[PDB]
Amino acid sequence: MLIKVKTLTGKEIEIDIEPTDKVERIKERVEEKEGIPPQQQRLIYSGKQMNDEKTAADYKILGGSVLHLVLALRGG
Amino acid sequence: MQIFVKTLTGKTITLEVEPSDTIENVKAKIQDKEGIPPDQQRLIFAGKQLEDGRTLSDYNIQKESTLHLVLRLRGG
Amino acid sequence: MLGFLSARQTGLEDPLRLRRAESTRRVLGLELNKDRDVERIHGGGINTLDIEPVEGRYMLSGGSDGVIVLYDLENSSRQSYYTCKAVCSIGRDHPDVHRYSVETVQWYPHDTGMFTSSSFDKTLKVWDTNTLQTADVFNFEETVYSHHMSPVSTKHCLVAVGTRGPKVQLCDLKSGSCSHILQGHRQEILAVSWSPRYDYILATASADSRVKLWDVRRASGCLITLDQHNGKKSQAVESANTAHNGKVNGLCFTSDGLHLLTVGTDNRMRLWNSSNGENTLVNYGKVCNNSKKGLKFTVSCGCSSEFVFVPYGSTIAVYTVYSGEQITMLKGHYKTVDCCVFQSNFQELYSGSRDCNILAWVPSL
């Protein structure tokens, strides 16, 4: 499926993932196409901060399901 | 150039504006586009009131941007 | 506490001694927990809670907006801190949701598969825990403040339902017949409760300051009519034998079933004997309540001295049942407390309030 990870500025980064990828995979894919390493993301899908161990199928992420990306500058 | 605004009724309309243009004329354009009075609009960009006595160039607005239209509110 | 461990080890004291002493110590050190949370799901207040009797795992809650959440109190995570995630919920989108406030949700005794609820929509629905579908619904002619199922009866499955009419209703979850009624009260029936010990002894509290124990097998009135002064101010039973001075809106048999705690709007508790209705003169001091519906409260189990947890204004009060001393006053809420339920397994207390919160109190250390 395609998830388009749109950030604050409105830029709509496209991403592709299999239905069972762990959200760390999603953050890593965002790293490749956008450049922010996975430590500094906080992906928010439909008002639930996604947790780094859940599988994407947990949240019922479908084709064209827009996430939100917010920078955590500290990010450990 | 032009700009996108998302009216209240779900529709979206495109406004032909210039950066020098003031927000009062922007609200007047919203009016004669669909007709909610200059007082009742409250344009939102990046979660900021678009002040009536200012221009788009003040708020760092460029082409293919988006402005959000809501109903006038107040504090409490 | 090492003394208790050694005493248990060398067989001096029975293991019962350490078990009960430690449970009492934990309940005495009860405090609110920020190391635990219960997810906020009710739009309005929480009117009722009932941890499941067997295994103490799930937990219902009757929101004042008609939503029946079904929590899960087991820390399925790995961290010390966790939140009791809501497994299921009878949301407003549900076809058979309660239209108005749900004020009693109780698990079907001896069977966690089902559970029951009742609301001001004048309905009592028998919910199936698995598919969340109404197995049976009984429609009353008037509201339903509180209902209760016998936690001991393996023979019958009647359900006392205290409507705001003067007549206690008995609904049968087996072949439906709400015909059986118990006449004798004079005003609304704000809180009923079956006897945990005897199968057929039902204690019903009303708003006319009378607490009556009914032998539902008997069809000629009530066994007893509780009287404050134990018959000192003797008067025939036409306008006398009032267990309180104002509305009496809460009943809770002690765990053993030997004593019937009653709390009423006159701001007093009274530990009545459950076999002859003789007030035992336990003081309890002045307990504050002003609610105008069923006030829920529970009594500890498996502790040396039986504690009672009564909603006291916006705070939970912890009294010792058989001495009346005030142990403490748990203080963490923002509005009046409507229901506190004791988790007997681990000595934990969950207290839903009117501020949409369900604060889980747990012992310290």
Partner: protein, 146 residues
């Protein structure tokens, strides 16, 4: 009505607002959870404040009870996380949809009105000294939002 909420959910999934995100928490569609990213050029920058929406049984013609879950520093929002917008209590309008109430709240995060405040203790600080306000709000954001 559900169908109104269904249409809102679909048209929000398709074309989401920029710095907002709301979706049902579980099976019950009447109980959403939302999220207001702190607007840029504000003490709330980089923050993620979680709301908790509750739609009534007549949602088009009756406001939803939104209430902050992340303790926000604001004259118009009490420590309990409750808001006091006029649009949300008195001047509710069906045409206003959840994507709009959330955005209006986001805008009001930067445009409080200490006159008639829900928290006069903070309102006095805001009215008198705005320099300290932008630091106390910043520390609250850093200690709750991040």
């Amino acid at each position: 009505a559900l169908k109104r909420i269904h249409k809102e959910l679909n048209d929000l999934a398709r074309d989401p607002p920029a710095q907002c995100s709301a979706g049902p928490v579980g099976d019950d569609m009447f109980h959403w959870q939302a999220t207001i990213m702190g607007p840029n050029d504000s003490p709330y920058q980089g923050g993620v404040f979680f709301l908790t929406i509750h739609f009534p049984t007549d949602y088009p013609f009756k406001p939803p009870k939104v209430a902050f879950t992340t303790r926000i520093y604001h004259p118009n929002i009490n420590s309990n996380g409750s808001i006091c917008l006029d649009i949300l209590r008195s001047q509710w309008s069906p045409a206003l949809t959840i994507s709009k109430v959330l955005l209006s709240i986001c805008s009001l995060l930067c445009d409080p009105n200490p006159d008639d405040p829900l928290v006069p203790e903070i309102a006095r600080i805001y009215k008198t000294d705005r320099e300290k306000y932008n630091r106390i709000a910043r520390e609250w954001t850093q200690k709750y939002a991040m």
